Design a binder for this molecule. Structure first.
Ligand code: BCL
Ligand SMILES: CC[C@H]1c2cc3[nH]c4c(c3C)C(=O)[C@H](C(=O)OC)c4c3nc(cc4[nH]c(cc(n2)[C@@H]1C)c(C(C)=O)c4C)[C@@H](C)[C@@H]3CCC(=O)OC/C=C(\C)CCC[C@H](C)CCC[C@H](C)CCCC(C)C
Ligand SMILES: COC1=C(OC)C(=O)C(C/C=C(\C)CC/C=C(\C)CC/C=C(\C)CC/C=C(\C)CC/C=C(\C)CC/C=C(\C)CC/C=C(\C)CC/C=C(\C)CC/C=C(\C)CCC=C(C)C)=C(C)C1=O
Ligand SMILES: CCCCCCCCCCCCCCCCCCCC(=O)O[C@H](COC(=O)CCCCCCCCCCCCCC)COP(=O)(O)OCCN
Ligand SMILES: COC(C)(C)C/C=C/C(C)=C/C=C/C(C)=C/C=C/C(C)=C/C=C/C=C(C)/C=C/C=C(\C)CC/C=C(\C)CCC=C(C)C
Ligand SMILES: COC(C)(C)C/C=C/C(C)=C/C=C/C(C)=C/C=C/C(C)=C/C=C/C=C(C)/C=C/C=C(\C)CC/C=C(\C)CCC=C(C)C
Ligand SMILES: COC(C)(C)C/C=C/C(C)=C/C=C/C(C)=C/C=C/C(C)=C/C=C/C=C(C)/C=C/C=C(\C)CC/C=C(\C)CCC=C(C)C
Ligand SMILES: COC(C)(C)C/C=C/C(C)=C/C=C/C(C)=C/C=C/C(C)=C/C=C/C=C(C)/C=C/C=C(\C)CC/C=C(\C)CCC=C(C)C
Ligand SMILES: COC(C)(C)C/C=C/C(C)=C/C=C/C(C)=C/C=C/C(C)=C/C=C/C=C(C)/C=C/C=C(\C)CC/C=C(\C)CCC=C(C)C
Ligand SMILES: COC(C)(C)C/C=C/C(C)=C/C=C/C(C)=C/C=C/C(C)=C/C=C\C=C(C)\C=C\C=C(/C)CC/C=C(\C)CCC=C(C)C
Ligand SMILES: CCCCCCCCCCCCO[C@@H]1O[C@H](CO)[C@@H](O[C@H]2O[C@H](CO)[C@@H](O)[C@H](O)[C@H]2O)[C@H](O)[C@H]1O
Ligand SMILES: CCCCCCCCCCCCO[C@@H]1O[C@H](CO)[C@@H](O[C@H]2O[C@H](CO)[C@@H](O)[C@H](O)[C@H]2O)[C@H](O)[C@H]1O
Ligand SMILES: CCCCCCCCCCCCO[C@@H]1O[C@H](CO)[C@@H](O[C@H]2O[C@H](CO)[C@@H](O)[C@H](O)[C@H]2O)[C@H](O)[C@H]1O
Ligand SMILES: CCCCCCCCCCCCO[C@@H]1O[C@H](CO)[C@@H](O[C@H]2O[C@H](CO)[C@@H](O)[C@H](O)[C@H]2O)[C@H](O)[C@H]1O
Ligand SMILES: [Fe+3]
Lengths: 62, 281, 306, 54, 43, 248, 48, 54, 45, 44, 60, 45, 45, 54
């Protein structure tokens, strides 16, 4: 598993999957951080007197 | 083509993503991974703005507008015709701005300079997100954002500013405006001083940083120094944008009434709250 | 961490620099003042000398009279009560005379004549100060760039307080001398003339104010990013181009596709700053005198749906 | 057209390939969004109304 | 000739593979377009 | 109110706005031409002038008179990087990186690049060296902040390379420009202060590893530093961010 | 964490605390805010 | 006519090819959009009407 | 077509794989958001 | 041949084979998910 | 021939084995789901649901 | 949790990882379907 | 440099122009076919 | 008239060529737009009127 393994084909597949995993994981990290940031702003809005003092539409619907 | 001194700087390295896949220059532009991303997002945004123009039925550049979804959609999706195109273009614009900043980071690394420029640009990006992401979400509706039109986004500005009376009484607005105005004044002074030193009266010798220090000490009794003036310019601009995003993050979330009434707290200080005479007595 | 060169981590102090003298009259010059460590953490900690010529003293005297006149009127509005004066300080106002007086000087002192007097004081002070900046550039043999950059803001100021009231035929149009009084004057000016947002020159002035902020963020960040190569010494980078100037040029060459020089970026800067007040003065001048409803004007010129 | 391979004697393949990839994917998203904007070809709404899911 | 530092044989092979990809991509697009036209013709 | 239109809807405001469009076009032309006094004309990557030079013509020459008889600088004019730039182009086509042929930190290319500036000291308005060491200056002292004299200097590999000995200060600016650092061999290297993190007990340098401070260029005089030497020192120090990176 | 940075965080927290205390004790939020700002500025300006 | 090849004695073919490609694509997009903006030629709703797909 | 392996003779795979990974994750997130915004597909109710 | 990346033909062949194996596996997984979703709620 | 360090390859090997197990289990489950869907498709295509057979069993 | 490493002195990991992956995936599918079965969480309506 | 600012020769320019004309004419013919097909479909005159 | 070629002795051919090309395209687009704005020359609306497509 670490000293014997099976074939270099496995190492190549693992390396390619590792690279694609790096890319997808950076994309996932940035996406999830955006989701956390917007969730924080929304939850701060939850505990504020907004929705008790709503504001009208600032621009026509369009 | 290159400048007469460019070639010794066009070396590999400094790229965050890739490293030779997207390490080249198209004309003067440095194309990186983020160069590709920003080109894609910007091209998509422009084409979608034109498409929304044909859906709107106008070809006047000053009449084209791309409105966000109505208040009824809350913070959800929307059909492309209603508010969906605005949401896609907001995605494209955010991606383009972020990719631009990261491409600047790559260029900074390749030139071995500081990262002040992408940081100062991230400030503008966060002001934009305050207007299109933070304030709408804290308010709960994408319809609280502004449309993508030359004059309709001024309509958004005016309607929002009058939803709370005269916006001039927001104090974060006041400090942001003071920062903007003093930043413009500082820019005028800096440009004028450097041009005056580099360009003397007529056919005489170029001046020195001591000479410009001398001029501004003979003018206003002070000089901040050539490092200090650039520090001050960066600080004034960044803090103006910061307190701009601050005045629009507390507006409609913490304060809901006419902002002028804020200034009542000072005139009702108990010691002099009830004194006869004066404007408010 | 990595140092960003936003604050000086080490301060050094030496002999008091009395400055140079090309054609400077040494007699009017002051002596070096104290040294400010707190303010020296950001720049030159030295204060003074200050040159006090003939236009300089004229400007000081006239500005003292203007500010003091406003102060005395503010005290009068307070009932001479210091507590009120510190309570209603923002809400005070030395308002101009009401419109029925027109441009006439025959207004009561309590009814706008004092505003005329203070306005004369400030007019004289500001014009003498412009002459002062020009003369101080003249003495050191420098270009008059600061004088003209000042003249741009002076023109916006003159339009707001002098030229537009004359054209409209009443001092009532001018801006009051109050804190919130002039804020209210601004908002009411926009409302009366129908959404000043649709003034094209208001839009241009905002374009150049936003551009001043953008350009100074860009220039300050650029110079701080190449300050490790002596980028601060901009004049020597003009005379003897170094690696700082080349790296600064190439950053924007590779980002935007075009770049400035160490000298021409300051041409960009001065023009971006002065166009603010130039276009603003034009826009205020056209308001009322030529266009009374900017949104209807916009409708007639594109810019707005019919 | 038999000698169009000479287009590679003008352009380095590395830049042309990335330019073409960006262009093609941009165009694909462009047309998909165009169709998703008009009510006639918005397949999501077509399938929603055909199967009475509203 | 001149720039890009390529040979005619290298260019020919590169264009051949690029044309293989071009025609594969175009054919997949054509089959997609015909399926859509059967589903909801636009003419 | 003069709201009268000469033709169509063209009133005085329309005249003003079109006049400003014309003036802005002229001003942008002027500003761009004033910014083409360095690095022009454009050149191919082999150094020959390029086919395209841009829609903007080059401006007329202008002459600066340097204050101390240093000569008249005319810009624009002929230009040349009068130094041995050691790079080899990686691709035959334009627009690709040029790889360094050798040690880039030593050849002075890429982020380590330096400019052949005048090999003369920097003169203030009094005709004296603008920057001189603390000792050479008369009366200058550390007025506030940490005093970084005698402190160890720790490279990016976390090994001490030397100790700070003196600070070079600016006479008309009163700014601390350079730190003098002594290595194991008793020789002195200059460090720009924008690259050093002056802590309480050490003066860290993230740009350079410990076994690179000796590679910093030296100075012909121990009291005066010329623009060429300053540029070489700064370029070498800032090149370590990319090139001294692999050694932490 | 520099001496200045620790002094700055401490100045912020002590400003908040004394501002709360003098806002409750002083009868208004303005008095507490002024006292807190004054003490915190006098604390942060002075070095170690 | 038969001597216009001399144009490549003035302009670098790489610059001109990139410029012409960008210009052609933008012009094609703008003409497609002009046609698609007018109700007479918006083929999507033309087909939707001719097939009662409304 | 059987010469598509030569795409690796021009582009360094070490970077193209990372590029593909980020591209695919972004595209998946995109289509999921498109569906969630649809009333007929908003599976999160 | 061109050798822009320093990959021999056989190395490129091996890597491309591995990449296309993974590509077909991923494509098949997506196809199975697509058919399952289409049966559950078709979009046509 | 370039690959990575053995330590990351150990995590890669473990995750690869786990993903192979999960992948075979998912293949079985999704094959069954697709077969169920195929029978559903042929049932919907058939004239069934015009002849709903009664309940063979009590509710229970 | 220190001594738990001795578990790989007992079972061959090359097979244990496959078995555990099967187990955890099937547990996931069971939980998904259980939430589907209850009417208050069925996300596939 | 009217003999070629771009450094081309009158021989290379001939061949480049010939191939570019070939491509331009192919593109133009495709456009003509598309124009006529649309003109049959819905003429604009 | 027959000595107009000497203009190339005073103007760089490259800049003049690109300036005149962009000038010509801008003028052509402006004239087409002026015609399209005018209803009597909007050939699309004219064709729609002829064939009653509205
Ligand atoms: C509701 C209000 C209206 C509005 C009403 C007006 C009016 C009225 C005016 C502006 C003007 C401007 N508006 Mg507006 N404006 C609106 C909304 C905006 C928004 C926005 C995001 O909504 C922005 C960014 C702006 C921005 C601007 C600026 C670009 C411009 C001010 C230039 C300036 O710096 O003068 C500041 C500088 C001066 C006024 C001159 C000062 C220099 C002189 C020499 C002073 C001497 C100083 C003296 C000697 C000593 C000083 C005292 C001591 C310091 C104590 N407006 C809305 C729609 N706006 C001004 C303009 O010109 O635009 C056409 C103007 O008159
Ligand atoms: C390009 C447009 C921008 C701009 C530019 C600009 N402003 C300028 C200039 C320029 C180029 C100058 O050269 C000039 C200047 O001197 O700058 C430092 C100036 C200036 N812009 C100023 C302010 C200013 N600029 C503003 C705006 C702007 N200025 C625009 C954004 C604003 C705003 C936003 O409202 C203000 C308030 C001043 C700092 C200065 C002009 C000063 C002047 O004219 O002073 C006259 C004096 C008076 C009328 C009152 C003096 C009050 C004192 C208390 C009198 C008593 C003094 C006392 C006796 C001193 C004792 C000293 C001893 C103890 C030693
Ligand atoms: C993390 O949040 C985010 C999302 O969702 C909230 C998103 O969906 C998106 C938008 C989704 C995408 C970025 C997908 C768009 C695809 C591309 C960027 C394509 C780029 C170009 C190519 C593949 C061409 C080059 C290839 C070959 C030569 C973004 C930006 C995002 O940041
Ligand atoms: C203060 C007054 C101005 C206020 C703001 C108004 C608008 C600002 C416009 C700035 C100038 C635009 C660019 C001028 C130079 C230019 O065209 O550069 C080219 C790229 O242009 C571009 O990329 C142009 C982009 C424009 C976007 C809008 C490359 O030019 P080059 O590098 O070859 O240099 C010139 C050699 N002749
Ligand atoms: C509002 O107004 C509207 C828009 C409605 C109307 C206005 C319309 C206007 C103003 C339209 C203007 C149209 C114009 C001027 C169009 C011009 C189009 C052209 C010239 C298109 C040319 C296309 C050429 C192509 C596609 C050629 C491709 C060639 C190749 C692919 C071959 C490559 C050549 C090689 C490789 C040379 C070989 C070199 C060596 C060294 C062997
Ligand atoms: C709004 O307006 C709308 C969109 C409605 C209408 C507008 C439509 C317009 C303007 C459409 C424009 C369409 C165009 C111009 C489409 C062009 C499409 C093309 C040219 C597609 C090309 C596809 C090419 C592909 C997929 C290439 C595959 C190539 C390879 C796989 C290269 C193989 C090379 C390898 C593997 C390495 C070679 C190396 C050696 C050593 C041989
Ligand atoms: C906005 O637009 C909408 C969404 C409305 C409509 C438009 C949609 C469009 C135009 C979408 C465009 C989609 C495209 C172009 C998608 C392209 C997808 C491609 C080409 C995906 C290729 C994937 C290749 C993969 C995943 C290869 C993976 C290979 C490996 C990971 C190798 C190692 C793994 C092996 C050998 C076996 C498995 C073992 C492990 C450890 C994973
Ligand atoms: C219908 O009836 C209801 C359900 C209502 C009520 C009736 C309930 C009934 C009948 C319940 C019966 C319950 C019983 C009998 C439960 C028994 C539970 C036990 C015994 C649980 C034991 C758990 C033990 C564990 C999880 C031990 C783990 C140990 C290890 C992982 C040891 C690690 C070994 C290693 C690392 C390798 C060893 C090798 C060397 C060299 C040390
Ligand atoms: C709002 O007010 C309105 C518009 C209503 C009324 C106001 C009207 C006004 C103010 C009108 C003003 C009109 C004016 C001032 C007109 C001035 C016209 C002039 C001076 C025209 C001159 C034209 C010269 C031309 C067209 C020359 C063309 C030359 C050539 C085509 C030859 C090119 C030169 C060559 C080849 C020389 C090269 C040779 C060598 C050896 C280098
Ligand atoms: C304790 O306090 C003491 C008494 C010691 C001093 C304190 C004084 C205080 C508190 C002063 C407060 C001053 C304030 C708040 C002033 C605010 C001024 C503002 C906001 C001004 C804003 C705009 C003003 C403008 C635009 C004025 C423009 C004026 C002109 C352009 C010149 C006007 C010239 C005219 C009208 C004609 C002059 C010619 C003749 C013949 C009269
Ligand atoms: C980048 C991805 C952004 C996704 O954001 C989403 O995009 C789609 C278009 O793709 C928009 O809108 C589109 O899809 C939605 C939801 O499927 C459909 O109701 C609608 O017919 C269509 O116009 C959504 O309102 C927006 O929320
Ligand atoms: C340098 C600027 C000073 C010169 C200005 C020249 C024009 C001066 C204004 C015009 C003269 C006043 O014009 C008169 O004004 C008074 C009110 O004041 C009014 O008199 C009724 C009318 O409005 C007008 O008859
Ligand atoms: C932009 C820089 C170059 C400027 C152009 C050079 C000439 C400078 C002076 C030109 C001024 C005239 O410019 C022209 O003014 C007329 C005045 O009715 C405008 O008028 C036209 O549009 C307006 C607004 O939609 C309509 O209400 C009006 O019925 C119609 O005639 C034109 O749209 C404009 O193109
Ligand atoms: C961060 C620095 C500033 C901190 C500000 C934090 C928010 C406010 C904190 C204090 C809140 C309570 O503070 C206290 O509230 C009561 C409310 O009745 C007010 O007190 C007021 O009414 C009380 C009775 O209730 C009277 O005894 C008192 O004479 C009167 O001033 C004052 O406001 C303050 O004494
Ligand atoms: Fe500067």
């Amino acid at each position: 598993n670490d000293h014997l393994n099976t074939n270099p084909k496995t190492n190549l597949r693992l390396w390619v999957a590792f690279q694609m995993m790096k890319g997808a994981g950076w994309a996932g990290g940035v996406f999830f951080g955006t989701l956390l940031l917007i969730g924080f702003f929304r939850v701060v809005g939850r505990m504020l007197p907004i929705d008790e003092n709503p504001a009208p539409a600032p621009n026509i619907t369009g | 083509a290159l400048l007469s001194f460019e070639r010794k700087y066009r070396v590999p390295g400094g790229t965050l993503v890739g490293g030779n896949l997207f390490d080249f220059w198209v004309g003067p532009f440095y194309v990186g991974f983020f160069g590709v991303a920003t080109f894609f997002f910007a091209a998509l945004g422009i084409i979608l703005i034109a498409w929304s123009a044909v859906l709107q039925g106008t070809w006047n550049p000053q009449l084209i507008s791309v409105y966000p979804p109505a208040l009824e959609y809350g913070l959800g999706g929307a059909p492309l015709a209603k508010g969906g195109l605005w949401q896609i273009i907001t995605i494209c614009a955010t991606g383009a701005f972020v990719s631009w900043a990261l491409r600047e980071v790559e260029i900074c690394r390749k030139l071995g300079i500081g990262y002040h420029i992408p940081f100062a640009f991230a400030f503008a990006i966060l002001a934009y997100l305050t207007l299109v992401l933070f304030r709408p979400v804290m308010m709960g509706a994408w319809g609280y954002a502004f449309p993508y039109g030359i004059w309709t986004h001024l309509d958004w500005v005016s309607n929002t500013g009058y939803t709370y009376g005269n916006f001039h009484y927001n104090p974060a607005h006041m400090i942001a405006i003071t920062f903007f105005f003093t930043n413009a004044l500082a820019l005028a002074l800096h440009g004028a001083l450097v041009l005056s030193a580099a360009n003397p009266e007529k056919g005489k010798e170029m001046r020195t940083p001591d000479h410009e220090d001398t001029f501004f000490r003979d003018l206003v009794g002070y000089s901040i120094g050539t490092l200090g003036i650039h520090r001050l310019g960066l600080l004034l601009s960044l803090s103006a944008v910061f307190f701009s995003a601050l005045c629009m993050i507390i507006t409609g979330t913490i304060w809901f009434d006419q902002w002028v009434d804020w200034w009542q707290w000072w005139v009702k200080l108990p010691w002099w709250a009830n004194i006869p005479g004066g404007i408010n007595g | 961490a990595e140092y960003q060169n936003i604050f000086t981590q080490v301060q050094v102090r030496g002999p008091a620099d009395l400055g140079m003298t090309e054609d400077v009259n040494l007699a009017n010059r002051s002596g070096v003042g104290p040294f400010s460590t707190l303010l020296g953490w950001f720049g030159n900690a030295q204060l003074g000398p200050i040159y006090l010529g003939s236009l300089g003293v004229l400007s000081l005297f006239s500005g003292l009279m203007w500010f003091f006149t406003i102060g005395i009127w503010f005290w009068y509005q307070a009932g001479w009560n210091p507590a009120v004066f510190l309570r209603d300080l923002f809400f005070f106002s030395l308002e101009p005379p009401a419109p029925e007086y027109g441009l006439s000087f025959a207004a009561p002192l309590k009814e706008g004549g004092l505003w005329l007097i203070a306005s004369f004081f400030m007019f004289v002070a500001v014009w003498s100060w412009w002459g002062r900046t020009y003369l101080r550039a003249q003495a050191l043999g420098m270009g008059k760039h600061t004088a003209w950059a000042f003249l741009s803001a002076i023109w916006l100021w003159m339009v707001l307080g002098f030229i537009r009231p004359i054209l409209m035929g009443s001092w009532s149009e001018a801006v009051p001398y109050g804190i919130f009084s002039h804020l209210d004057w601004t908002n009411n000016f926009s409302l009366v003339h129908g959404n000043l947002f649709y003034n094209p020159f208001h839009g241009l002035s905002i374009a150049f104010l936003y551009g001043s902020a953008l350009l100074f963020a860009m220039h300050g960040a650029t110079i701080l990013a190449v300050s490790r190569f002596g980028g601060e010494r901009e004049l020597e980078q003009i005379a003897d181009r170094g690696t700082a100037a080349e790296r600064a040029a190439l950053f924007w060459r590779w980002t935007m596709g075009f770049n400035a020089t160490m000298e021409g970026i300051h041409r960009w800067a001065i023009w971006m700053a002065v166009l603010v007040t130039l276009t603003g003065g034009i826009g205020i001048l056209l308001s009322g005198t030529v266009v009374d409803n900017w949104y209807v004007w916009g409708q007639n010129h594109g810019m707005a749906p019919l | 057209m038999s000698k169009f391979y000479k287009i590679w004697m003008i352009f380095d393949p590395r830049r042309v390939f990335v330019a073409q990839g960006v262009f093609l994917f941009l165009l694909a998203v462009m047309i998909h969004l165009i169709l998703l904007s008009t009510p006639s070809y918005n397949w999501l709404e077509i399938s929603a109304a055909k199967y009475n899911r509203v | 000739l001149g720039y890009t530092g390529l040979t005619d044989e290298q260019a020919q092979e590169l264009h051949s593979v690029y044309m293989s990809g071009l025609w594969l991509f175009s054919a997949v697009a054509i089959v997609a377009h015909l399926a859509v036209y059967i589903w909801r013709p636009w003419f | 109110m003069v709201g009268v239109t000469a033709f169509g809807n063209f009133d005085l405001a329309s005249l003003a706005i079109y006049s400003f469009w014309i003036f802005l076009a002229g001003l942008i032309y002027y500003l761009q031409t004033e910014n083409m006094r360095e690095g022009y004309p454009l050149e191919n990557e082999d150094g020959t002038p390029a086919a395209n030079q841009g829609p903007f013509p080059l401006p007329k020459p202008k002459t600066f008179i340097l204050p101390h008889g240093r000569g008249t600088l005319t810009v624009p004019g002929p230009e040349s990087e009068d130094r041995p730039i050691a790079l080899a182009r990686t691709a035959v086509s334009e627009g690709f990186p040029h790889a360094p042929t050798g040690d880039p930190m030593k050849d002075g290319v890429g982020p380590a690049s330096w400019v052949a500036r005048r090999d003369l000291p920097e003169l203030d308005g009094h005709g004296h060296n603008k920057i001189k060491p603390m000792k050479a200056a008369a009366g200058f002292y550390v007025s506030a902040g940490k005093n970084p004299i005698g402190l160890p200097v720790r490279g990016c590999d976390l090994e001490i390379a030397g100790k700070v000995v003196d600070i070079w200060v600016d006479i008309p600016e009163q700014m601390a420009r350079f730190l003098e650092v002594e290595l194991k061999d008793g020789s002195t290297r200059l460090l720009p202060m924008q690259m050093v993190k002056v802590q309480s007990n050490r003066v860290h340098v993230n740009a350079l590893s410990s076994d690179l401070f000796a590679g910093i260029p030296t100075i012909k005089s121990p009291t005066e530093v010329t623009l060429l030497e300053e540029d070489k020192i700064c370029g070498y120090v800032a090149g370590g961010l990319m090139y001294a990176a692999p050694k932490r | 964490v520099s001496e200045f940075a620790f002094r700055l965080m401490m100045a912020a927290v002590i400003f908040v605390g004394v501002g709360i205390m003098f806002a409750f004790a002083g009868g208004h939020w303005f008095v507490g805010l002024v006292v807190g700002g004054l003490v915190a500025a006098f604390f942060a300006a002075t070095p170690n």
